[PDB]
């Protein structure tokens, strides 16, 4: 039941309490954001490749395509999703 | 520039200095770790999709395979690569 937002809360809470931690934990926060962004870029790319494969009727890769769907749903549980207003929302 | 290990080390450094942060920041560290694990699991699946495409000779989607290679390379720049002994290694220490 752990979420991306939980980690983000903890990081800012930490250096607001202890300002000497600002430089290192804002950096960690930026690295976490970078990681999430890169992951979601590759995930979308994988999803679109999987969609293409399905449309081509290539049943040999059907297990793989199904795995991409399962993994994408699991990701949204932890990291939510960004809507059209640029807000990251959770279930 | 700055790597996954930098973030990892920063979390630990912080609660070693301020023990009262250990609960919140250990949790954060485990979330970071989970996110990296799920990303890398999906990445490996994406890589095998591309492998399948290329084995079939399906050139229509070759651009997607090149895209996946580029993104995996960029990921490894930041997050390194876990070797067969489960050690995450970076840069020229890979392969």
Numbering used by the authors:
A (entry chain C): 2 to 92
B (entry chain A): 2 to 96
Authors' text:
One mechanism by which phages and other mobile genetic elements are able to overcome the CRISPR-Cas system is through the expression of anti-CRISPR proteins. We previously reported that gene 34 from Pseudomonas phage JBD5, which encodes the protein AcrE1, shows anti-CRISPR activity against the type I-E system of P. aeruginosa strain SMC4386 (4). We show that AcrE1 binds to the CRISPR-associated helicase/nuclease Cas3 and that the C-terminal region of the anti-CRISPR protein is important for its inhibitory activity. In summary, these experiments demonstrate that AcrE1 functions by blocking the activity of Cas3 without inhibiting the DNA-binding activity of Cascade.
(c) Structural overlay of the X-ray crystal structures of the AcrE1 proteins with an N-terminal (blue) and C-terminal (red) 6×His tag reveals virtually identical structures. Thus, the unusual nature of the C-terminal sheet was not a result of the presence of the 6×His affinity purification tag fused to the C terminus. The C-terminal β-sheet region is unusual because both sides of the sheet are exposed to solvent, contrasting with typical β-sheets, which pack a hydrophobic surface on one side against helices or other sheets. We also examined the packing of the C-terminal β-sheet within the crystal and observed no contacts that stabilize it in this position. Residues 82 to 90 form an antiparallel β-sheet that protrudes at a 90° angle from the end of helix 3. This sheet structure appears to be stabilized by multiple interactions between residues at the base of the sheet and residues in helices 1, 2, and 3. A salt bridge is formed between E41 and R89.
